[PDB]
């Protein structure tokens, strides 16, 4: 197949001759014809629109190789790639039994108009019904549903081949699997209701080992305007959590702390906490502490912004909000700067703000302590980022002191 693909220009006639002979020759033509007709899914009617005659030979060869050697993954991947490419091309370019059924159910211009509207550009049901009613003036729904599947059958084969190929990787390069996972995700996102039957059972049996490379994409695609798509993604993530919880632990807890992006996160954290609840609670506490350890800096920034925008009610409101939000280290700052509220209230009815800003700036000009800003040991929470780690490593302790870096906003 690879050699034939290389010399496509010099072998385009032989393939056409083989196809013509199949529906009614050089040595290679007859040899390939005999190879294809070997007795042990693809019909000429489906590839009769948007698919070229010589390209069908490649698909037949790939299908035969896959059925003859179902234990190899190269054949499945090649067949899936070919089917997906041709399916996408025919779908993009598309935007006797049917005629007999339509005529029998509708017992010359009317027939032509109905036939043209049945496959005009195939909320779709409502639009089709309205167009048919406005043209002719109900068996049309069945005809449309039967004709849409025929022009949408290559994707089914591509999905089946991709699922089979992935099942054998629970033997191929990672780049060869990431592409397949991305294509499957794109198919499930773009056209979800057209091939929902295949994905329904396909996503309920595939392993979780090859799906660990597109986790961020799965989380980012949790707001799809559908019903079963969201549930399927949530179930897949929950299954991935098992035997591998250090992959979706941090994103789930981070997102948890529109209701579409809330129920899924709650279900994910609930399913992940059914095994080691202590680890979940400890990691949540650690995340909260980190977020709260991000006082003096806030006051200095607020004072600088207020002074820069001074040259009213907005300043008073901002100061009140900051004081209310700010109410080991916090106690010392509050005790050493407890007159800020009183000074602001007295000046409301402005040197106090300038004095406070100057004092904060002078006191700013590094080394801190973890005890003053809690301290656990023998933890079971995974490290922040373990994409490439056969055995997860849990945190044991934290640094007693934290350093700060200059020439930046606020790096610690």
UniProtKB/Swiss-Prot annotation:
Cystine connections: none
Protein family membership: Belongs to the PI3/PI4-kinase family.
Species the sequence originates in: Homo sapiens (Human)
Cellular localization per UniProt: Nucleus; Cytoplasm
Domain of life: Eukaryota
Subunit and interaction comment: Component of the SMG1C complex composed of SMG1, SMG8 and SMG9; the recruitment of SMG8 to SMG1 N-terminus induces a large conformational change in the SMG1 C-terminal head domain containing the catalytic domain. Component of the transient SURF (SMG1-UPF1-eRF1-eRF3) complex. Part of a complex composed of SMG1, DHX34 and UPF1; within the complex DHX34 acts as a scaffolding protein to facilitate SMG1 phosphorylation of UPF1. Interacts with PRKCI. Interacts with TELO2 and TTI1. Interacts with RUVBL1 and RUVBL2. Interacts with UPF2.
Protein function: Serine/threonine protein kinase involved in both mRNA surveillance and genotoxic stress response pathways. Recognizes the substrate consensus sequence [ST]-Q. Plays a central role in nonsense-mediated decay (NMD) of mRNAs containing premature stop codons by phosphorylating UPF1/RENT1. Recruited by release factors to stalled ribosomes together with SMG8 and SMG9 (forming the SMG1C protein kinase complex), and UPF1 to form the transient SURF (SMG1-UPF1-eRF1-eRF3) complex.
Tissue: Widely expressed, with highest level in heart and skeletal muscle. Expressed in placenta, brain, lung and spleen, but not in liver.
The name this protein goes by in its record: Serine/threonine-protein kinase SMG1
Region annotated G-loop, chain positions: 404-410
Chain's gene name: SMG1
Residue windows of the HEAT repeats: 209-244
Post-translational modification, as annotated: Autophosphorylated.
Additional note from the record: This gene is located in a region of chromosome 16 that contains 2 segmental duplications. Other genes that are highly related to this exist, but they probably represent pseudogenes.
């Amino acid at each position: 197949a690879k050699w034939i693909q290389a010399e496509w220009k010099e072998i385009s006639g032989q393939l056409k001759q083989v196809y013509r002979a199949q529906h009614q020759l050089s040595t290679l033509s007859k040899n390939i014809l005999t190879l294809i007709e070997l007795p042990s899914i693809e019909s000429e009617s489906t590839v009769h629109i948007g698919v070229g005659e010589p390209d069908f030979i490649l698909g037949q060869l790939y299908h035969l190789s896959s059925v003859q050697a179902p234990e190899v993954a190269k054949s499945w991947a090649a067949l899936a790639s070919w089917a997906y490419r041709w399916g996408r091309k025919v779908v993009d370019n598309a935007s006797x039994x049917x005629x007999x059924x339509x005529x029998x159910x509708x017992x010359x211009x009317x027939x032509x108009x109905x036939x043209x509207x049945x496959x005009x550009x195939x909320x779709x049901x409502x639009x089709x019904x309205x167009x048919x009613x406005x043209x002719x003036x109900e068996g049309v729904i069945k005809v449309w549903r039967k004709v849409v599947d025929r022009i949408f059958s290559l994707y089914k084969l591509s999905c089946s081949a991709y699922f089979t190929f992935l099942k054998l990787n629970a033997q191929s390069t990672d780049d060869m699997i990431v592409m397949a996972t991305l294509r499957l995700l794109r198919l499930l996102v773009k056209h979800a209701g057209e091939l929902r039957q295949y994905l329904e059972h396909g996503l309920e049996t595939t392993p979780t080992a090859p799906w660990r490379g597109i986790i961020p994409q799965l989380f980012s695609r949790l707001n799809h305007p559908e019903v079963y798509v969201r549930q399927s993604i949530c179930n897949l993530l929950c299954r991935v959590a098992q035997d591998s919880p250090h992959l979706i632990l941090y994103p789930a807890i981070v997102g948890t702390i529109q209701a579409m992006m809330q129920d899924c996160y709650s279900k994910i954290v609930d399913k992940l906490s059914s095994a080691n609840p202590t680890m979940v609670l400890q990691v949540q506490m650690l995340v909260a502490e980190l977020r709260r350890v991000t006082w003096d800096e806030l006051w200095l920034g607020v004072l600088l912004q207020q002074h820069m925008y001074v040259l009213x009610x907005x300043x008073x409101x901002x100061x009140x909000x900051x004081x209310x939000x700010x109410x080991p280290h916090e106690k010392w700052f509050q005790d050493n700067y407890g007159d800020a509220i009183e000074n602001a209230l007295e000046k409301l009815k402005x040197x106090x703000x300038x004095x406070x800003x100057x004092x904060x700036x002078x006191x700013x000009x590094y080394i801190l302590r973890l005890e003053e800003i809690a301290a656990m040991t023998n933890t079971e929470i995974a490290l922040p980022g373990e994409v490439s780690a056969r055995d997860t490593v849990t945190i044991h302790s934290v640094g007693g002191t934290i350093t700060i870096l200059p020439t930046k906003t606020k790096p610690k």
